[PDB]
Structures are given as structure tokens and as C-alpha cells.
Ligand binder design. Structure first.
Ligand SMILES: *[C@@H]1O[C@H](CO)[C@@H](O[C@@H]2O[C@H](CO)[C@@H](O)[C@H](O)[C@H]2NC(C)=O)[C@H](O[C@@H]2O[C@@H](C)[C@@H](O)[C@@H](O)[C@@H]2O)[C@H]1NC(C)=O
Ligand SMILES: [Ca+2]
Ligand SMILES: [Ca+2]
Ligand SMILES: [Mn+2]
Ligand SMILES: [Mn+2]
Lengths: 246, 251
């Protein structure tokens, strides 16, 4: 079993591929732009990936990796009811370039399943796009489309840290994502099956993508404060969290 | 604190950078070239590095990382008394290109301290260069020069696995390297402090470098069968739990 893991208590490391408006400052990863006064911008799109590709599975041995990632994000919308568009943790093709903005979170182009996109993402959607989204803000699992194959309601604690945990169990093909707002004591979780070897390439770049609205006040910040990741290609979370995120 | 680790029970992944004659076959890392019949070549030079850079220290916070690496190597010299030149575990500048061959193991150019080399290595020297080496085969700690700052005698169990453990304790600035030949039940060790922040860049590539002789039958194989590495970089200016490490990763 090949194992690998990284843990960043803070950023500002040559370990990231920054695209769009993504930037590092105050040792935190700011995916979308924030003006001098500290307020969010419109039409922003930023992505950040770990500089080295991760092998998700091995075509020749049929082996499929199990992995887990955790990060703390902070989303602040000056006008809560105007929050848009969200942040997503994504697994994309290695040289991948940004996709459509706003509602597509920079990782997808349509709400129609397109295997050629070779992209899977867990989204934290703050703006309800009526053509495809649920009524409220939500956590969703996106498989080669912006229309989640499964979602769960999420109560956004504006400007409050969100502690996220995403795991993939190759044995059950189950992808689980949970979000906790320690300040409001709330927690959410979503789980669905994903046939990984069929939706993604053998090697992918893991990272984040975020965007803001295009109309006057539909914007918010999208900051990541810490990030851990562990992969095992042929996972004991109990020791993972302790020796990596806690 | 930032942490990084990996463990390879066999090679195959494209998480390795190969230079010179370095190659992967039979799921093992072969640093120096071998002929169809399985015999070593002359004037061979091969290097292999983890594709991702490791941060050894943080200039702005004064923090210095503690790390450990373990790997199993197998060195086979058709003619034992003709064994040359050796294999080295090295920390080099990220885009680093191979250096001098043969006695310099592909990581150094002279036996004169040159800080600009920005390279540290732990060598497993099978051939004695009278110009700077000790009389017998040895393990040595090289700091920006091929002339080790400290060495220890090593009894080469030809063609037998060598289990190596190298650790760096930022608290004591001590670098320790040990080698064990389980089949012959022998073991060796060396230690010396190294002011890491002064000999290397903030980010380095870790890996292996090996070479063979230029003269006659002075050659041998340089194969790596497995490799683990773990690093821990604090938030401010503490050793590492080698036990937990060694269990869930090597033993
Ligand atoms: C947060 O965003 C809301 C939706 O954009 C704002 O309400 C909207 O304000 C517009 C002027 O900026 C106005 O044309 C819309 O009719 C109105 N829409 C709704 C559904 O209320 C809201 O702005 C404040 O409240 C409105 C009603 C006006 O009084 C504005 O002058 C105010 O800025 C925003 N809320 C806050 C607390 O800023
Ligand atoms: Ca949306
Ligand atoms: Ca020598
Ligand atoms: Mn959605
Ligand atoms: Mn020597």
C-alpha cells in the first residue's frame, strides 16, 4: 500500500498552483478577491491545487485508493441573504484550467452529465440557482455536472469557521462529507456512492475552487485556513484527525 | 505544524523524478544501469527524487523540521573486492542536475567545502578514494563536500539487503544514520550535528544518487526496494516519534 499525506496549519507555501484571483495573504488561502477595505468583489473566480498529482486508482492492478481531507473554511457575506456562489473541494484533470464562473463554481460548464469533464467535487453552495439547485444553501456531491446527485441542507454561520471533513471509502465506494460550525454547534452530513474509476482519470489534482455572483451585491469571501489530506492506494480516521487536524 | 509523509513498499508511481540511468523495473528502483544478463555497467550515474519538494525549515519563523527516512537497499558487486562507488541519500536544491560521477556519487564536485553546493548527503561508500576516504567501506555524512565530516566502518554484506534509517532531530541538530544487514545480523551507526538552515535551501528534493567506477570491474548494482519518509515542521522556533513512524510505515 502506497500512503501519502500532507497537513498545512497555515499557507504561503510553494506547494500550491494558484489560478484566477486565488491568493495567499495573512497566511490564509483567499480564493476570491477582497478589496482594500476587506470587502468581497463581483465576478471573482479563484482556484488552488496541491502542486503534486494524486493517484486515485491504478488501471493495471484494479486498485482504488481510499482518502480523506479536512480543511477549515470561512465564508463571509457582507449581506447574508445576498451570499453567492460558494466554494468547492475538487478532484480535476492534472493540467485543468478554470471552467465557467458564478453558479458553476469554476469547475463545471453545464448541469448536464458530461463524463468528458472528468471532475468530481463536493460543493458548499451559498446561492440557489433555480435551474438546478435545491431551495436553500446546501452541501452537495457533484459528479461531472453542477447538478448534485445528492444534497443536504446547510445552515450557513456567516463569517464563522466551518470545519469540513470529506472521506472516500474504496471498499464501499461511498463518499461522505460533513460540515461543522463549532460556534453555532451545528453539523451537517451527506453521503452517496461514486464509481470513482469511471468518473475521473488515474491521476488528479486536488484543491479548491470558488466564485462570486455577477449582480451588485451577490458576493462573499471564500477563505481556507488549514488543510490536510491523506491517501492510501493498495483509512483509520481515528488516528488521522488526531495526528493531523486536531 | 506542517507535516508530510509517504511510504512505498514498491516503486511504480509517477511520483518519482528519474535522472541519468535511474530506472524502475520489477517494481524496484535501480539507480545504476544493468546489462541484459543482469550485470552492472561502468561509468553509470543515476538519481531519483520524490516529485514533491520538502520544506526543511521556515526562514521567516525560524522553525526547523525534524524528519526521518528509511529504505531497503541491495548492493551487489560481481567482484566484491572491486565494488564501486556507492549510493547516497541526498537533500538537494529543487531543480538540481547531476554532478560529478564515480567517486563523487553524482552529488558533489570537489572534496573542498563549497556552501554554494547547498547539498547534504548520507553516503554508503563502497570504494575508497585515497584522496579523502577512510581505508574501508564506510557510512558517511557529507555536508557540501565529498569529504565526510564523520564516517563509520561498514561491513558490506554483498548482495544482501541493507535496511537503512536516517533521522534528523531539529532540537539537537543531530543527524543519525544506521544500517542493518539482517541476514548477517550486523549493524552500524554514525552521528554528527549539522546546522541544516545554513547548509541547505528552505525547500529541497530528497532522493538517491549512485554511481559505478570508471576503471576495470569497478562496478556493482544499486537497488532500492522500499522507501518511507516523514517530516514535521513546527509553527515556531521537537524530535519525532520514531516508534509510531517505524511501525505504521516500515516494520
Ligand atoms: C441585502 O440585499 C437585499 C437584496 O439585494 C437588499 O434588498 C434589496 O435592496 C435593493 C436596493 O439595494 C432594492 O432594489 C430591492 O427592492 C431590495 N429587495 C428586497 C427583496 O428587499 C437589502 O438592502 C437593503 O434593504 C432594501 C429593502 C433597501 O432599503 C436598501 O436600500 C437596503 O440597502 C440588503 N440588506 C442589507 C441589510 O443591506
Ligand atoms: Ca448554486
Ligand atoms: Ca569513495
Ligand atoms: Mn448546488
Ligand atoms: Mn567516502
Amino acid at each position: 500500500a502506497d500512503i501519502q499525506s500532507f497537513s498545512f496549519k497555515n499557507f504561503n507555501s510553494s506547494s500550491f498552483i494558484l489560478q484566477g484571483d486565488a491568493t495567499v495573504s495573512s497566511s490564509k488561502l483567499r480564493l476570491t478577491k477582497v478589496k482594500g477595505n476587506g470587502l468581497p468583489t463581483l465576478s471573482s473566480l479563484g482556484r488552488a491545487f496541491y502542486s503534486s498529482p494524486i493517484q486515485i486508482y491504478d488501471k493495471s492492478t484494479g486498485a482504488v485508493a481510499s482518502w480523506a481531507t479536512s480543511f477549515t473554511a470561512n465564508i463571509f457575506a457582507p449581506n447574508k441573504s445576498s451570499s453567492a456562489d460558494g466554494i468547492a473541494f475538487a478532484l480535476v484533470p492534472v493540467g485543468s484550467e478554470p471552467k465557467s464562473n458564478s453558479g458553476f463554481l469554476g469547475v463545471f460548464d453545464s448541469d448536464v452529465y458530461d463524463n468528458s469533464a472528468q471532475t468530481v467535487a463536493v460543493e458548499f453552495d451559498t446561492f440557489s440557482n433555480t435551474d438546478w439547485d435545491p431551495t436553500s444553501r446546501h452541501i452537495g456531491i457533484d459528479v461531472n455536472s453542477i447538478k448534485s446527485i445528492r444534497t443536504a441542507s446547510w445552515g450557513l454561520a456567516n463569517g464563522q469557521n466551518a470545519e469540513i471533513l470529506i472521506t472516500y471509502n474504496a471498499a464501499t465506494s461511498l463518499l461522505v462529507a460533513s460540515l461543522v460550525h463549532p460556534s453555532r454547534r451545528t453539523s451537517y452530513i451527506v453521503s452517496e456512492r461514486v464509481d470513482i474509476t469511471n468518473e475521473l482519470p488515474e491521476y488528479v489534482s486536488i484543491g479548491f475552487s470558488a466564485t462570486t455572483g455577477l449582480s451588485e451585491g451577490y458576493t462573499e469571501t471564500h477563505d481556507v485556513l488549514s488543510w490536510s489530506f491523506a491517501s492510501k492506494l493498495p483509512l483509520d480516521i481515528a488516528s488521522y484527525l488526531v495526528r493531523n487536524v486536531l
